[PDB]
Ligand binder design. Sequence first.
Ligand code: MGD
Ligand code: MGD
Ligand code: SF4
Ligand code: SF4
Ligand code: SF4
Ligand code: SF4
Ligand code: H2S
Ligand code: W
Lengths: 214, 963
Amino acid sequence: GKMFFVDLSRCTACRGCQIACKQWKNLPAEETRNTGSHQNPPDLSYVTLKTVRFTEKSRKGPGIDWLFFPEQCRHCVEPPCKGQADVDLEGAVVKDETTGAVLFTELTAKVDGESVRSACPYDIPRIDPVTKRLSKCDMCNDRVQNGLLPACVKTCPTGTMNFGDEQEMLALAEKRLAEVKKTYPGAVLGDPNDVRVVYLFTRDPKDFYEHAVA
Amino acid sequence: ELQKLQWAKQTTSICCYCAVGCGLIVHTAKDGQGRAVNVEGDPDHPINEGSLCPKGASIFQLGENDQRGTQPLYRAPFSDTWKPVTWDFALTEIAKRIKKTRDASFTEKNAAGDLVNRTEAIASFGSAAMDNEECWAYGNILRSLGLVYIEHQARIXHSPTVPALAESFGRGAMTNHWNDLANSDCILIMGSNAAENHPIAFKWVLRAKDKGATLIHVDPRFTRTSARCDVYAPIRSGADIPFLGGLIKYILDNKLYFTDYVREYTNASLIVGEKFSFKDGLFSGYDAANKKYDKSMWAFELDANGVPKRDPALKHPRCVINLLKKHYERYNLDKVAAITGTSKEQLQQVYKAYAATGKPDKAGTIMYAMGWTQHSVGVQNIRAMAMIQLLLGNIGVAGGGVNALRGESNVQGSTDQGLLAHIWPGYNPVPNSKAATLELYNAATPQSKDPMSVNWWQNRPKYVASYLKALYPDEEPAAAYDYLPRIDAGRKLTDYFWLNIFEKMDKGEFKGLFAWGMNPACGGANANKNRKAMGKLEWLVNVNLFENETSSFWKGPGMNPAEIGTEVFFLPCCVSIEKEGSVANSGRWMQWRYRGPKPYAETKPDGDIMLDMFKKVRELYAKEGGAYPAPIAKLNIADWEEHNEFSPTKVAKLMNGYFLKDTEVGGKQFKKGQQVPSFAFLTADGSTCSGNWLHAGSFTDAGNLMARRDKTQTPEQARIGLFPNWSFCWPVNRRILYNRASVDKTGKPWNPAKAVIEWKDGKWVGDVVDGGGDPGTKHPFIMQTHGFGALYGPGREEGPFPEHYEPLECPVSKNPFSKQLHNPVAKAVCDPRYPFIGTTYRVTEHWQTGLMTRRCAWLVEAEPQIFCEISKELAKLRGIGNGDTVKVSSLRGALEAVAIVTERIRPFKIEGVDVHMVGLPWHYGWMVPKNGGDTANLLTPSAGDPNTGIPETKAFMVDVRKV
Ligand SMILES: Nc1nc2c(c(=O)[nH]1)N[C@H]1C(S)=C(S)[C@@H](COP(=O)(O)OP(=O)(O)OC[C@H]3O[C@@H](n4cnc5c(=O)[nH]c(N)nc54)[C@H](O)[C@@H]3O)O[C@H]1N2
Ligand SMILES: Nc1nc2c(c(=O)[nH]1)N[C@H]1C(S)=C(S)[C@@H](COP(=O)(O)OP(=O)(O)OC[C@H]3O[C@@H](n4cnc5c(=O)[nH]c(N)nc54)[C@H](O)[C@@H]3O)O[C@H]1N2
Ligand code: SF4
Ligand code: SF4
Ligand code: SF4
Ligand code: SF4
Ligand SMILES: [S]
Ligand SMILES: [W+6]
């Protein structure tokens, strides 16, 4: 199976990944206002599968600890979203056995939308109020099964985003974690044994987002 | 296979936004016959490797945009509505307006009776966003019309800084390039927010860190850059020179400079004449009545042959290095810490980290873009940067240099093509009224009696002659020299520049304005004044992608169209991916790009617009006569077009140049019609043409070198990432400028592990050597008159050594380094009703005035509204909560914005008083989007810096109040 390694210690919050996700899928933009933050859209939605969250933590000395979190579906190895969806209709949520991606099909309008989201410990699924289908990051499985990197991975300039087979990415995550710890001693990996999107947080993952880790 | 791209033709392009120069791939439906269906990064491009920041990543939304202009739009005087009009009518009427204006305004001779042959009733703005071929032909069309008020983006952000680099090194360009950043051992980012404003650069910045580099960000604010640097040092606005002066003293006191480099490759050994002095913040030769210096008091002591005297022992008390040590001993840590606001701890940490790159096995680079360098001593700020690098041996080496980050995709090229009032293409000056002949013009070039000084500018008569024959191939150069307009010699040079055009605008001295690829209604400071001043125009021609605040100023906020009688023509141009051409990025890479989809609707590339427009002007003069029709009728435009269309390929070949007859230059026979292989083979007798001598080598008989996409590299090239076979950079593919300073006088690199060039087997291996010659036989700075890197730069108006003069007029009253508070060679009101320091900067997601990016829904999604970033201290003082609507006001105007309260802004401690700074983006305008806000330039003053002729947009007094 495939896997993301997301090294947040290199992220410049450029939000190229947020736009590249919408460009590839030709997704519409949300109606957004500025409410005191550069973060926008403020949350994932049916037409926003990835948004970069901004969190400012104070630190003594000059500056702050600015924590950037490009949120996306973790593509769990054992996705609980599939277990809750299989209660109503099997086939609405599908696991690609070659890439490991968890995919929502058009039969998710047949299932209880809010139950599937509540089953996800990362609060990832979003439902359209009209078509009642579920939408989320789909790993760009179309590109992956055609030898292309996901749009958000290819567009990232910093090296935050990495993609490949799960074995080589864990070895990269383990090697990078030991190097990042020299500058950020509280560097941790987000549930590396359960998900295929392995974030490297520079500090407490909860400081990045409430549902950064399960 | 991917259905989205299955039947689409793939082409490559270059990003149309910042000067990083990222490569794209465009997929066009129906095998190139339809619209674009996908735009993303080029994985094979060596700079970005397929990555794109959000602006580049959304170019598909920019091109395939139903808000784009579709056809010319005409606005009759006192009308309140656009009227759609054909291209033929639009260009016929403008050609009538141009001729009617030119005929009634053409002065063949000035008041002194000297030939000028110009018209001063038409001004032109823009543009760094056009192709290099389009920029070059545009400038020549304007000058063939007689214009002298020709300005564009480069004047505002770069021109205050490039004299510092030309004085220091002999050229104004960025010394290294983007990939080279990964070789640095310590990266000092100061006056730049590179992670937001040059985002792909942080690919290489972070790769430097992976190899052990220390990343230092010096900035009054904590930005997205600051989060990814090892050291964030805050500095209060305007304290850059005290900061850098302290580093100079630190380097000199602790003997951390590279002595062998300094002794041989800088002017440290030159003997300054006894007339030089510095006391009480004033250099010698100061005219207190006129607030100007007699620079001849700073001249070097010359030997019996006219060459400046040198003491290679560096012990003479009038040696540059010793006078340098004396000048900067005042900049002790305690004084610098007090004025910068930077802790003494942090200063020592940063000084030690960066000064450690003075060792030959270590390289330090300084990155700046615009920052706050627009004021009078901005040039001295960059001079100090260059001096620090010369002391540490960082100029010409991999991972070193002064990386002055350029702004727009082609602001380098647009400057190279002479879209500034003072320069022809190739940085040959626009002659003044006293340069009555071509011989007198060439006599102004300085000569040098030093056999080791290359002094490459002595070849200028070849470049002026070939440029004139590119324009007029059958007139002899001395005759065609009389065709082009000249400025007044007795007039201040800044009178022809960006700001004075806006002031002459407000005085009704301009009949017509070309707003070509610029948005002056938002980009120019004091928007209220400039928007009302545009109503004083007879006619306005705006060429852009969308209807905008400049096209539609007559129906702007507070405007009554029935009272404004300006006649506005809007001509919609096509986007970058809809046309072929080249753009020159920050590292001078001239990169060719191809058309993806056809031009949308009836939009036209700029080249076709100006060519067809100039042809209408030409034909109307051929059947009506008029004032001085000579330069219009003889202009060589046949080499500009192909198949009834502007030809980017043929223009690029003419700019490179070709032999007009058989000639033997430089021990080689060349036959007529052949392309010129390099500017070394240009002549002055008329046998050679060349639109831009810097382009001689870009398009030879071997093909279009700018279109090279070859990643072939030798081991030494690949180790520092020269990529010599990817595209082409001027001059003659020298990727790292001044690379002769990277080796010793036997040709061995100071840093073999990061060698740029090396003398191996009687040849220079690696980069193209910047200046031919055996090792140890030539001085390394070939464009300098004397050949050395200038620690002492007597060509600067403020003095040969940078000196702190307070840029902040209002809150500061004391200079700890001298008696002189403000620049002695440069009246802000400082009204107490506006006690806060307003400033403007950028965010990653928006571009310039936002004319482009406020039309892309994904970028508006991320940054929908104008904001105002303030400290927690300011918010508590004014009772403003995060997310509240605030009113920011100044003497110039007022606007509303949503407050962003953040610890990323901290109060400045100035003379025992907390001084607060508020930040605003200038990315917004009243047209689009809804609730987006207007431009921050409603608050900025139109009072410009007497030196630079540029207004203040980084430190202007404001008030902010809760609404
Ligand atoms: N995303 C994006 N990128 C752009 C642009 C854009 O509009 N959007 N514009 C392009 C253009 S044309 C230009 S010229 C370049 C400009 O590139 P930048 O110079 O990076 O643009 P700025 O954000 O205006 O200024 C950068 C930093 O200077 C800091 N600063 C302010 N005052 C001082 C000072 O006194 N001393 C020091 N050391 N720093 C100070 C500000 O806090 C800011 O973080 O960017 C280009 N890149
Ligand atoms: N307050 C404040 N003011 C500033 C600044 C600041 O930092 N603060 N920055 C200053 C700086 S550094 C700059 S360079 C100026 C820029 O001032 P402007 O040039 O007026 O900024 P824009 O017009 O928005 O961006 C350039 C234009 O190029 C157009 N364009 C794109 N492609 C093409 C093309 O193919 N052909 C043509 N003809 N046009 C095209 C875009 O639509 C866009 O309108 O703003 C300056 N003003
Ligand atoms: S992997 Fe594809 S779908 Fe998921 S966030 Fe990235 S671009 Fe969007
Ligand atoms: S993150 Fe949530 S939605 Fe995504 S696969 Fe895991 S459980 Fe399902
Ligand atoms: S593209 Fe990369 S650096 Fe930019 S916000 Fe996304 S993850 Fe961070
Ligand atoms: S805006 Fe600059 S950094 Fe971003 S994609 Fe375009 S060229 Fe690259
Ligand atoms: S620029
Ligand atoms: W600029």
